[PDB]
Amino acid sequence: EKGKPLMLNPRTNKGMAFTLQERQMLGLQGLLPPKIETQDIQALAFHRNLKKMTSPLEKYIYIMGIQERNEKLFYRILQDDIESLMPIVYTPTVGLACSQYGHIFRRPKGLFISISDRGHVRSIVDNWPENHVKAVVVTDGERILGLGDLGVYGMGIPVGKLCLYTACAGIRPDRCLPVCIDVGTDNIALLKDPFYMGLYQKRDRTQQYDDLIDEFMKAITDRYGRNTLIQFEDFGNHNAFRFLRKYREKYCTFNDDIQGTAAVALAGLLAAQKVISKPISEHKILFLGAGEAALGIANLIVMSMVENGLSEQEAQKKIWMFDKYGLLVKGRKAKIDSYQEPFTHSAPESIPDTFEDAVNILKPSTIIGVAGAGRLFTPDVIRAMASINERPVIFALSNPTAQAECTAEEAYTLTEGRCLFASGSPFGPVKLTDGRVFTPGQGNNVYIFPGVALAVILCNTRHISDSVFLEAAKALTSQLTDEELAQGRLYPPLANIQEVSINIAIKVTEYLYANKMAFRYPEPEDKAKYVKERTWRSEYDSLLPDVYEWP
Amino acid sequence: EKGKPLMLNPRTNKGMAFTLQERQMLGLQGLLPPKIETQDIQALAFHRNLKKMTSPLEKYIYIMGIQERNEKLFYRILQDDIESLMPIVYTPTVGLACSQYGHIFRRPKGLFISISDRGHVRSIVDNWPENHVKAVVVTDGERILGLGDLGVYGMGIPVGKLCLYTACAGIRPDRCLPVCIDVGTDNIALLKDPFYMGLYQKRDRTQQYDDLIDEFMKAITDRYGRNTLIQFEDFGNHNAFRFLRKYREKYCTFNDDIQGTAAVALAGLLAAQKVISKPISEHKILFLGAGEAALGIANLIVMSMVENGLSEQEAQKKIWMFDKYGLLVKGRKAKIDSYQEPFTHSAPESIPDTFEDAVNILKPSTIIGVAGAGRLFTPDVIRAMASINERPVIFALSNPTAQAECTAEEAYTLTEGRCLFASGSPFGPVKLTDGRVFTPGQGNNVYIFPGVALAVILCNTRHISDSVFLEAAKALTSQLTDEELAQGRLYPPLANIQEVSINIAIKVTEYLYANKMAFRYPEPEDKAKYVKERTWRSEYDSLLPDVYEWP
Amino acid sequence: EKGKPLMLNPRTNKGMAFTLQERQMLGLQGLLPPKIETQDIQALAFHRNLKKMTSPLEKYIYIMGIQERNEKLFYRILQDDIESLMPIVYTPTVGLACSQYGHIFRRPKGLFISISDRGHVRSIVDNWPENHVKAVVVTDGERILGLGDLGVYGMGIPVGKLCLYTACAGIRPDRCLPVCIDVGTDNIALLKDPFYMGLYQKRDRTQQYDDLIDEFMKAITDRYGRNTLIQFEDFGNHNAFRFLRKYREKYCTFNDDIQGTAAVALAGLLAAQKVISKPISEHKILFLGAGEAALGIANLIVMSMVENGLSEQEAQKKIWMFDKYGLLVKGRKAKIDSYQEPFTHSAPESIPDTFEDAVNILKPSTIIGVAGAGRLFTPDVIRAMASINERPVIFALSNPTAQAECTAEEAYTLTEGRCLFASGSPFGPVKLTDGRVFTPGQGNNVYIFPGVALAVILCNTRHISDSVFLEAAKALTSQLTDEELAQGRLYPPLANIQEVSINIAIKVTEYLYANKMAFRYPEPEDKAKYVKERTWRSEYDSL
Numbered sequence A, B: 001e002k003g004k005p006l007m008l009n010p011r012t013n014k015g016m017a018f019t020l021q022e023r024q025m026l027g028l029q030g031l032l033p034p035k036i037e038t039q040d041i042q043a044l045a046f047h048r049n050l051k052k053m054t055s056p057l058e059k060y061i062y063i064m065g066i067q068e069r070n071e072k073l074f075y076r077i078l079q080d081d082i083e084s085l086m087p088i089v090y091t092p093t094v095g096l097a098c099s100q101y102g103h104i105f106r107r108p109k110g111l112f113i114s115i116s117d118r119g120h121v122r123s124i125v126d127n128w129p130e131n132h133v134k135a136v137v138v139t140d141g142e143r144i145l146g147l148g149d150l151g152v153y154g155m156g157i158p159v160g161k162l163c164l165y166t167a168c169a170g171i172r173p174d175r176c177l178p179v180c181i182d183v184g185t186d187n188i189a190l191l192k193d194p195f196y197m198g199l200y201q202k203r204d205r206t207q208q209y210d211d212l213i214d215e216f217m218k219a220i221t222d223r224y225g226r227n228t229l230i231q232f233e234d235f236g237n238h239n240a241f242r243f244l245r246k247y248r249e250k251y252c253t254f255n256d257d258i259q260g261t262a263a264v265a266l267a268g269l270l271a272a273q274k275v276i277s278k279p280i281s282e283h284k285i286l287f288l289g290a291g292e293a294a295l296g297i298a299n300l301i302v303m304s305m306v307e308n309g310l311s312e313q314e315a316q317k318k319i320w321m322f323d324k325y326g327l328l329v330k331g332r333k334a335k336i337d338s339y340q341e342p343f344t345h346s347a348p349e350s351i352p353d354t355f356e357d358a359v360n361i362l363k364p365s366t367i368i369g370v371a372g373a374g375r376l377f378t379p380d381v382i383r384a385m386a387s388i389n390e391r392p393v394i395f396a397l398s399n400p401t402a403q404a405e406c407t408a409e410e411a412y413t414l415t416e417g418r419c420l421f422a423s424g425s426p427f428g429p430v431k432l433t434d435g436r437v438f439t440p441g442q443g444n445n446v447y448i449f450p451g452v453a454l455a456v457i458l459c460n461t462r463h464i465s466d467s468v469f470l471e472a473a474k475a476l477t478s479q480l481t482d483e484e485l486a487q488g489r490l491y492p493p494l495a496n497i498q499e500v501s502i503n504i505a506i507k508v509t510e511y512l513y514a515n516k517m518a519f520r521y522p523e524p525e526d527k528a529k530y531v532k533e534r535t536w537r538s539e540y541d542s543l544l545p546d547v548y549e550w551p
Numbered sequence C: 001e002k003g004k005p006l007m008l009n010p011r012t013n014k015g016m017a018f019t020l021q022e023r024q025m026l027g028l029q030g031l032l033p034p035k036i037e038t039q040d041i042q043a044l045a046f047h048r049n050l051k052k053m054t055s056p057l058e059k060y061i062y063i064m065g066i067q068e069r070n071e072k073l074f075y076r077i078l079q080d081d082i083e084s085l086m087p088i089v090y091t092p093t094v095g096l097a098c099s100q101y102g103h104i105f106r107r108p109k110g111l112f113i114s115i116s117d118r119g120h121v122r123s124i125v126d127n128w129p130e131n132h133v134k135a136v137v138v139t140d141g142e143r144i145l146g147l148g149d150l151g152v153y154g155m156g157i158p159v160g161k162l163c164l165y166t167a168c169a170g171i172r173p174d175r176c177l178p179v180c181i182d183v184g185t186d187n188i189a190l191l192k193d194p195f196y197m198g199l200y201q202k203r204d205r206t207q208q209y210d211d212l213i214d215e216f217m218k219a220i221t222d223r224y225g226r227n228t229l230i231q232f233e234d235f236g237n238h239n240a241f242r243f244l245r246k247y248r249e250k251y252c253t254f255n256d257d258i259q260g261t262a263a264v265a266l267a268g269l270l271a272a273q274k275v276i277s278k279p280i281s282e283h284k285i286l287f288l289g290a291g292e293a294a295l296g297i298a299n300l301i302v303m304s305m306v307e308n309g310l311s312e313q314e315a316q317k318k319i320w321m322f323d324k325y326g327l328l329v330k331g332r333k334a335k336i337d338s339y340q341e342p343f344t345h346s347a348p349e350s351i352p353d354t355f356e357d358a359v360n361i362l363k364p365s366t367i368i369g370v371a372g373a374g375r376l377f378t379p380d381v382i383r384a385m386a387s388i389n390e391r392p393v394i395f396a397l398s399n400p401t402a403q404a405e406c407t408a409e410e411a412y413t414l415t416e417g418r419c420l421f422a423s424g425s426p427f428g429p430v431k432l433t434d435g436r437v438f439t440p441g442q443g444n445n446v447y448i449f450p451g452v453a454l455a456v457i458l459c460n461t462r463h464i465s466d467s468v469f470l471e472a473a474k475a476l477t478s479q480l481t482d483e484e485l486a487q488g489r490l491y492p493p494l495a496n497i498q499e500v501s502i503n504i505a506i507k508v509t510e511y512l513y514a515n516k517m518a519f520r521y522p523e524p525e526d527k528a529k530y531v532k533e534r535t536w537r538s539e540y541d542s543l
């Protein structure tokens, strides 16, 4: 293939970095301005122009424009400034862009499967040009974080995540497929817009919904394979959580809100155990929330303790849960699911009405907030922990900052700088009245999903075990330096996400092979060399024909 | 376009003549054996192998194999040995090949239009890949010369003629379209063959036949233009002749059996008038046959005489016709058509029962045989002419040698070497008993159709006048040298058909422009430079990209 | 994809078999004659046309023409008349045709790598249009069996072998790559020919030759993977056998003239054991030849003997070799390689200077001829075997019939119909004075190379063990029925090469999975269903 096609294909387009010889031999001479550049001077130009733009949304439109025209340059400028541009390409900017920029550009991207295509989903899947898709990320657009129901404009979230698959772990873009399932929208802003690109119906919540996602799983699997990695993104939590439980064993799938959160949470708790060398006997965990998030984090804490010598029944006894209906205790008016039973224990002396009460009676070393309510970690609960514990571990993991259980400021000030705090919410540094400044823990799922994804695909793995996320959590905290640990860092620097994501991937690769969860053989001797050599890189390949004299 | 496609396309394939640099830059390196040749050493190889083959049919299969793989090399070896290979590529070999080699190779070529496609002929025409067809040659396969009804195997004749369009006049092959109209076959050899490639029905001879050729003319014209040249080849004579009369004014069409024969005939008569300087007063022409062939030749003789000072009515009076029912005379039991009337005259003293009689009473300077009977120019008729005329002009133009009115041997021997003889049949040299050897006149339609075709296409001409064939006839004989004329040559050497065809084309180009029958403007000042520069040549073009250092 | 390109591509072109629906949908109406046919009608037409062709050369040209126009029709025709057309597409007529087809037609196929292209082999491999090549066959054209050095025209043999890969074992043609390495020709008629299509230089035997082969190995492996099966064919016996040792542990490689020849030989030897049931202790095998052919046959015989209770050194003691300088004995004046050492034994009291004298002293049960020196299984050698053994085994395997150690006639006549005779030559049936008719065994590498290839490709095997060829030999003899063994057959009928090839493939698939040399997972529970449902078939697909 030669001529204009090489320039209109972003996967081949080098733009001005097309060599004079390449331009002349491939029929590009005259179709490009008369100057040869390098990827270095290209990337510099787009950086200079990106830093004249102050709006995150303006940055999003400029960088996503480069993806559509030059793939290798898009992932070079992304990796050159990964900490700054990860929040542009993905969360939080991606949600704000979709809502606003979908109706202005109307540029189709990824594969759209409507409920109207029920019966023939394979025929729609077959229309996708790439024949070796390894990674599928799908949205229905119902629960976009901080916005809500964006319908088909949801497509941007799977696109933005797959960007970080490539940027962070070096997963090949051509092996990636962003999907948006359109079953309607409950947002009348879209239903009443004449220029809406989706289906004009309220969300189908009947058996036809469950049967369409069933058909989509079979369809993707039947074209690309049983080992094809599938992630549900910004789906309704009830749907997202019940689909993990339905497809986890049959298909190669994992969920960031449960399993990524568990791994990131455990990583922070393990990092806290390196500064606070508290013996596992002195450890008692209390959860605000007893749902799929709590169950997932609790499972990985139990499994961590069983590896460190404790018993499953002993580990569980060190974990307490407090839901809407108070503490989970054997013999309670409110219902306890079969999943919540292991962390449901014999009642203590006093039954706590509030969470502040529960803390004072149970005296936990750690409190974890996974109840999407609000500031339930009230100043009184934060002060009680500072009284009971020298260095209290306080994890407010409810992600929409509003729903977070406490702020970094109200955590560090009311614990006079002694608390080990982490959150999913982006709290800035917090300065005490003695003068010392505290930079809080920020658990991001970007630490886990790239590394796990690369390993599973590279190993041709068909099932993702709980232990993958345990091994991912240990791998993340293993990369924190003794200097960083002494500065109170609970998480590696996000600027090093590439080295971090690949080192997690090598350590999960080692686990999958050792526990017969890998189908790629022959098994490599050096799993580090295996992963690092199979990563996709942003360096332009030569498209120049090999011309030589016959000796 | 690069890679294997350049080699599988005969229009681009240079084979071993692909330059090392071309091979390396266009992705051919390794797909060809490791040797670079030239068109010169290529052509030499295929000539050496062709001259180890003695069978004309074996030669046909070998040379048609080169056409399908390398277009430019096919037309180079054809033009290098044009006199020898014209009878292989076209008549007489093409008819013998089609009949025998169609069922062994079953290789589709050209466009097939069946009577079953009535209503949708445009849709079939639209499926032909070339968008600028200038020349269409069509067969129904009914009257293949010396064989008969070959049905769809007829396709070979239009293919073979279009080869000579390119070889003789330099008409572009991509601008040429061979067509075969399948309305059935009356040959039970094909109708009973399970491996027959045509329609299993007797020839449709209803209104559906006439309406299909009508639809085909409109279809070709509606895609390619009103100026698109159309020739009917090896059609039934009744169909071929009535279709010339139906489409001659509406469409750009000419017929070789009438108009090519007339031009070739007149050319020989004009060549005879250069050796025999007989005044036009002493000229009297007698025809055996009064059909479309005779009418066409007679028309061009009249028009030649009117240009040389005689009157249409005087010229006609010098032409007599003798059909199945004897001499055409005013007041005769047998019918005289409105077309035959100008050459139907007041009866002489004696009414001739036989053609021998007619010769003795009329005492013609020239006799022309255009009656598809047999040896009607009997030894007695040939002897009578030798008695009446010093140098008798005897033209036996009935083409299947069997149907020819006399042989070269019986012409020259019974006229003791004084006759100026021509035929369409391939008679070898004839030696008299005094010792002198006579090489007879051989009127071939290849003298006319290439030159006429090139001129008409180059001039964007929509109507082919009788005068085109008059100008073609004068142009042919104008090329005979005074040395050749003294050796009794009535026709130029066939080895020089290229120079001959182009010189006719220049002279017809001049006529069409001067008589407002050309639509290509601006009109060229030098019609020689116009034609010779627009001819397609067998020389390989360079497909090498232009690589140069920037100064 | 649409219109003429579909018809000009042999992989897609169905010809007259293109359905009206397809012609209407793919813009073919008008480009094809009105007739619509079935592959059945097409096949019958080309079968009738080929029966009228007289020369095997003329037949080769006709069928190879169908291969370049309609690939599925070519493989239907070939599989319909496999026994008669295998000698046309491949040995023996492929070598004869290689000369003429090249000069006359000059039509290009396969991948050509020159010593001039050294350092740039990846460029050439990358120019091949197919991305999923699973089977590569390569020649330099030095030892074309029968004709010798045919230079760049030797390309015909790889093209011929890959046709049988597909015809016999249903290996997808688009995953098959024929390669010809041009390092020059020592053939003086070709060097003198102005229309020779190769390098006008003598065969480079310098380090540059060995380096080109290393670069070819790496290039193919770099693009298509380390799994990629590579087969060296009609190479110089020197290079061919030394390249097996070099690459067999690094790459997925096997040589037909050694490992294929060894497997077909053992299979016949195993077939003869089922008839006579000689106690394994009484077995004494004497080779005429101590080349890598004899070494390969011998290695597989000891492996069969070890599988049946014998120790390795006690199996080796039952195998003797006799070459140009006489019997291989410890301390002989003549040279003995390290590979010949296991079958070099302590001198008997009497040392034979003649092979007849070797037969008389050693008293062998089996004589295997692999020398290429002509009729050295002399009447007196054959008479001696008939005297010593009730049912003597005589294998004259030297391929060109004129360099065969004895004839079927000579074998059966001078043994009074008691011998079990196999050859690689096409000897006809032999009728004795007692009225009994003997059909000689004909060993053909086509029994082994298709089945072994499909199995290795399907199992994603990277190293082909000696045991693969022992299991292939066993699988071939298992095909032989009791009536066939009773009728004195040593090899299955070639008419059933497809069934034989797929049954062999299934047994090798089973071995590779059982011995952890198969890298395709998940592992199939039915290894027979796995193979049979992965076979490419001549039936047209709906376009």
Ligand SMILES: NC(=O)c1ccc[n+]([C@@H]2O[C@H](COP(=O)([O-])OP(=O)(O)OC[C@H]3O[C@@H](n4cnc5c(N)ncnc54)[C@H](O)[C@@H]3O)[C@@H](O)[C@H]2O)c1
Pocket: A132, A134, A170, A171, A172, A175, A457, A458, A459, A460, A520, A534, A535, A536, C222, C223, C224, C225, C226
């Ligand atoms: N690049 C191509 O166009 C292409 C396509 C198909 C096959 N091939 C070739 O076929 C052979 C077969 O491949 P293999 O099974 O040995 O691969 P592998 O064993 O190196 O990789 C194991 C699995 O991980 C996948 N993988 C590897 N690198 C990846 C990345 N950066 N992002 C996402 N997924 C990745 C592969 O598709 C495969 O399924 C290879 O040698 C290859 O060169 C090449």
Ligand SMILES: NC(=O)c1ccc[n+]([C@@H]2O[C@H](COP(=O)([O-])OP(=O)(O)OC[C@H]3O[C@@H](n4cnc5c(N)ncnc54)[C@H](O)[C@@H]3O)[C@@H](O)[C@H]2O)c1
Pocket: A143, A144, A145, A146, A237, A238, A257, A288, A289, A290, A291, A292, A293, A322, A323, A324, A325, A369, A370, A371, A372, A373, A376, A397, A398, A399, A400, A403
């Ligand atoms: N905005 C969003 O997009 C969104 C939506 C859902 C969940 N989330 C996040 O994901 C996590 C998982 O939540 P979920 O989907 O399992 O919700 P859920 O309602 O299924 O479970 C949350 C748990 O919190 C408990 N809870 C609720 N209100 C409480 C109160 N006032 N006091 C004590 N306990 C209370 C519930 O009993 C329940 O056990 C949460 O941390 C939440 O921040 C975000």
Ligand SMILES: NC(=O)c1ccc[n+]([C@@H]2O[C@H](COP(=O)([O-])OP(=O)(O)OC[C@H]3O[C@@H](n4cnc5c(N)ncnc54)[C@H](O)[C@@H]3O)[C@@H](O)[C@H]2O)c1
Pocket: B132, B134, B170, B171, B172, B175, B457, B458, B459, B460, B520, B534, B535, B536
């Ligand atoms: N070669 C191509 O791919 C191609 C195709 C279409 C147009 N063109 C360009 O567009 C311009 C328009 O052409 P034009 O009208 O001036 O042509 P023209 O005036 O040179 O020719 C007059 C007519 O004769 C035809 N003709 C010329 N040479 C011929 C040959 N060897 N065989 C058969 N027919 C022949 C032309 O198609 C045209 O209809 C040209 O300058 C040409 O370069 C090129």
Ligand SMILES: NC(=O)c1ccc[n+]([C@@H]2O[C@H](COP(=O)([O-])OP(=O)(O)OC[C@H]3O[C@@H](n4cnc5c(N)ncnc54)[C@H](O)[C@@H]3O)[C@@H](O)[C@H]2O)c1
Pocket: B143, B144, B145, B146, B237, B238, B257, B288, B289, B290, B291, B292, B293, B322, B323, B324, B325, B369, B370, B371, B372, B373, B376, B397, B398, B399, B400, B403
């Ligand atoms: N074999 C073929 O493919 C074939 C077929 C038809 C014509 N041709 C040739 O084309 C030319 C045109 O013929 P046509 O199609 O006009 O045929 P036609 O029958 O239409 O006209 C031929 C003329 O010859 C006359 N004629 C026939 N027999 C005669 C006889 N015994 N004596 C005197 N006159 C006689 C007829 O009256 C008629 O005027 C002929 O010269 C013929 O050789 C060849």
Ligand SMILES: NC(=O)c1ccc[n+]([C@@H]2O[C@H](COP(=O)([O-])OP(=O)(O)OC[C@H]3O[C@@H](n4cnc5c(N)ncnc54)[C@H](O)[C@@H]3O)[C@@H](O)[C@H]2O)c1
Pocket: C132, C134, C170, C171, C172, C175, C457, C458, C459, C460, C520, C533, C534, C535, C536
């Ligand atoms: N089970 C079935 O019914 C069935 C039938 C045909 C194809 N398939 C295909 O098998 C695939 C499974 O993946 P896979 O390709 O890794 O496993 P596979 O078993 O199809 O492949 C085994 C290996 O052998 C090769 N191979 C397979 N068939 C071949 C043939 N006829 N000729 C030459 N080489 C051949 C393949 O390239 C691969 O390297 C599926 O995608 C499916 O399309 C399945």
Ligand SMILES: NC(=O)c1ccc[n+]([C@@H]2O[C@H](COP(=O)([O-])OP(=O)(O)OC[C@H]3O[C@@H](n4cnc5c(N)ncnc54)[C@H](O)[C@@H]3O)[C@@H](O)[C@H]2O)c1
Pocket: C237, C256, C257, C261, C288, C289, C290, C291, C292, C293, C322, C323, C324, C325, C370, C371, C372, C373, C376, C397, C398, C399, C400, C423, C424, C443, C444, C445
């Ligand atoms: N069975 C089959 O289908 C098949 C297939 C391919 C090849 N082959 C045969 O395999 C053979 C391989 O051997 P090669 O010809 O390449 O020679 P080689 O050099 O490989 O070995 C031949 C051996 O025979 C010995 N020898 C030579 N002349 C002798 C004589 N007069 N007396 C005793 N010993 C003598 C040599 O010393 C040498 O050890 C070929 O002859 C070929 O015909 C058979």
